[PDB]
Amino acid sequence: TATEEYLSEFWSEIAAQTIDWIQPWSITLQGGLHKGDVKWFQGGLLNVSANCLDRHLPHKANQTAIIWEGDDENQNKTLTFAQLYSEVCKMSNVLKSLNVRRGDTVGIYLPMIPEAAIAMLACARIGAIHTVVFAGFSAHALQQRLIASSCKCLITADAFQRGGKTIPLKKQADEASVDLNITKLVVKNSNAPTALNKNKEHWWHELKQTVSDQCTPEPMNTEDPLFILYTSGSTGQPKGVVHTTGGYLVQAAYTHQLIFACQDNEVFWCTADVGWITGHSYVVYGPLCNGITTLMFEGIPTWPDAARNWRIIDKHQVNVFYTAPTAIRSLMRAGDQWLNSSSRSSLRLLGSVGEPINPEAWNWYHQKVGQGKCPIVDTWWQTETGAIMISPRASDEVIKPGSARKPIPGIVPLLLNEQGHEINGAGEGLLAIKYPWPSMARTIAGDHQRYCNTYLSNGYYITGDGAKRDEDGDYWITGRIDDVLNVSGHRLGTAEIESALVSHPKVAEAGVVGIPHDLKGQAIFAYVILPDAELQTELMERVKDQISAIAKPDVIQFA
Numbered sequence: 001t002a003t004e005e006y007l008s009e010f011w012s013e014i015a016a017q018t019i020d021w022i023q024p025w026s027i028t029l030q031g032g033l034h035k036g037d038v039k040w041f042q043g044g045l046l047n048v049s050a051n052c053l054d055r056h057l058p059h060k061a062n063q064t065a066i067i068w069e070g071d072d073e074n075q076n077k078t079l080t081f082a083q084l085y086s087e088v089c090k091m092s093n094v095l096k097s098l099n100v101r102r103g104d105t106v107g108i109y110l111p112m113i114p115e116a117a118i119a120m121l122a123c124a125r126i127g128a129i130h131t132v133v134f135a136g137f138s139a140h141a142l143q144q145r146l147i148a149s150s151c152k153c154l155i156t157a158d159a160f161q162r163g164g165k166t167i168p169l170k171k172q173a174d175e176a177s178v179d180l181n182i183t184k185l186v187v188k189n190s191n192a193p194t195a196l197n198k199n200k201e202h203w204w205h206e207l208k209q210t211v212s213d214q215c216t217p218e219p220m221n222t223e224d225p226l227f228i229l230y231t232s233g234s235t236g237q238p239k240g241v242v243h244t245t246g247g248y249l250v251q252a253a254y255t256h257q258l259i260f261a262c263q264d265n266e267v268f269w270c271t272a273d274v275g276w277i278t279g280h281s282y283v284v285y286g287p288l289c290n291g292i293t294t295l296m297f298e299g300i301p302t303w304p305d306a307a308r309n310w311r312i313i314d315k316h317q318v319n320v321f322y323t324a325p326t327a328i329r330s331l332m333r334a335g336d337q338w339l340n341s342s343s344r345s346s347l348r349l350l351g352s353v354g355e356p357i358n359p360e361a362w363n364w365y366h367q368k369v370g371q372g373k374c375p376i377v378d379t380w381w382q383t384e385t386g387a388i389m390i391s392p393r394a395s396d397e398v399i400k401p402g403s404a405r406k407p408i409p410g411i412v413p414l415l416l417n418e419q420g421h422e423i424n425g426a427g428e429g430l431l432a433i434k435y436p437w438p439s440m441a442r443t444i445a446g447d448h449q450r451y452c453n454t455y456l457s458n459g460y461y462i463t464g465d466g467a468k469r470d471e472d473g474d475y476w477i478t479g480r481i482d483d484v485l486n487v488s489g490h491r492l493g494t495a496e497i498e499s500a501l502v503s504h505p506k507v508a509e510a511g512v513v514g515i516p517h518d519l520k521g522q523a524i525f526a527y528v529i530l531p532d533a534e535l536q537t538e539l540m541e542r543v544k545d546q547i548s549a550i551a552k553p554d555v556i557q558f559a
């Protein structure tokens with residue numbers, strides 16, 4: 001109330017400093033968490049791509065905007081801001097010549113190549129709502145998101161390299177799009193010939209030549225939807241988490257600068273795929289809005305070997321490195337010897353996102369990777385918060401391995417006890433947020449009631465996480481207290497694993513849970529009510545083909 005005026009005025013001041021406005025706003029904050037009618041910067045006009053491209057020209061026109069490294073180490077690309085601006089303007093005009101209009105949903109099924117950032121930004125320039133589907137998702141998983149989003153246009157690619165092997169991405173898109181009325185825009189990511197159906201599918205490198213390189217950015221309302229991310233929950237199939245335009249970009253860009261403090265001459269490398277929220281906020285939108293060079297890597301941390309990340313960090317002089325504890329633990333399982341070939345002297349800051357980091361992995365990250373010279377910002381947040389919420393600062397003394405420390409400014413977390421009351425001082429319980437914040441997800445696509453029932457309780461936002469808070473006010477995130485899983489860094493739901501199992505003809509009922517696993521964090525344990533080991537393999541095969549390899553059950557227990 002009075003607190004809300006303080007938060008309103010704080011965020012209003014951040015919005016006017018952080019991003020360019022086509023038109024200023026008239027009401028900073030409106031609505032709240034009791035009703036779930038939160039509105040930020042109502043009356044304002046802006047465009048996300050203008051903040052990430054146009055406004056950096058021409059002073060940073062020749063600064064590298066995106067460094068790209070291929071799974072094959074000999075494959076490298078850079079795009080300056082001027083180059084990236086023209087690529088986005090062209091793909092905007094290509095989408096409009098394909099009938100994509102403001103407020104249409106556009107599907108994106110791309111690997112970590114520059115065209116993934118261009119596709120997102122091009123949707124943002126024209127007011128389309130992109131829905132990025134993780135390119136490691138199977139055809140069935142892609143297909144279910146295309147039906148749920150009702151998108152008429154899908155941006156995808158022929159193939160890409162992961163580890164040694166080629167991933168047939170276009171075949172999976174075709175399988176997913178069979179009985180749907182989808183126009184495909186296809187990026188040629190191979191030197192190998194590919195044959196398209198000319199009626200409904202188009203080559204990007206051809207259509208780019210049919211359109212102008214200038215495209216006026218849409219003047220977007222702050223509450224226009226920017227994108228949908230299909231996200232696993234504790235009940236049911238993944239739901240479409242809707243983020244809007246104004247508050248999302250304000251807090252994504254502000255927290256990127258507040259936590260990582262990159263200067264115009266530095267290289268920032270977050271390893272998250274664009275298919276997850278971390279890829280949205282801290283690979284594409286946050287860094288490019290701040291005018292900071294961001295790095296996109298196509299492959300995996302262990303190919304050709306467990307030294308790959310540091311060879312990339314030395315090759316491009318990465319200064320800030322932001323990755324997941326699953327990757328940290330697997331590289332330290334590989335052995336400290338893989339740290340001996342590199343220098344890593346360009347690094348000044350390490351980051352951790354996506355799951356708790358245990359002290360053994362924090363110390364290995366700090367002493368060995370960072371050589372003792374880098375703070376570790378352990379950032380807690382979620383898809384539904386849109387941006388970092390609780391995090392150490394680089395400026396802070398380096399202490400408490402495994403603690404996310406204090407909320408960022410303008411954010412009020414709290415703990416609730418088993419009877420629903422707010423815990424004062426030191427304790428533990430349910431992690432919640434007390435007041436609205438600019439980058440909060442605004443609804444579930446189609447079912448705002450399911451959004452309110454799932455996230456809003458007695459005027460608070462319910463994270464679904466447990467936490468401790470010590471005598472200093474520092475937070476310690478213990479993990480999901482609901483049924484949501486964290487498996488090798490991926491947020492997963494039991495419902496999609498259960499239905500993928502039961503759709504097998506021999507399976508009648510299934511029950512999936514998570515058990516502790518040292519390398520994966522959680523391993524997927526499935527109870528299956530059908531009887532051999534041959535069937536365990538085909539039932540693990542069923543889950544990989546329905547969802548992804550990441551969701552494959554690690555133990556199948558027949559009941």
Ligand SMILES: CCOP(=O)(O)OC[C@H]1O[C@@H](n2cnc3c(N)ncnc32)[C@H](O)[C@@H]1O
Nearest residue numbers: 353354355356379380381382383477480491
């Ligand atoms: C940005 C990823 O967003 P999501 O994929 O939506 O996962 C969100 C869920 O990951 C977990 N989590 C994320 N960061 C941390 C962290 N620093 N320490 C501990 N746990 C963390 C937590 O359970 C949260 O609710």
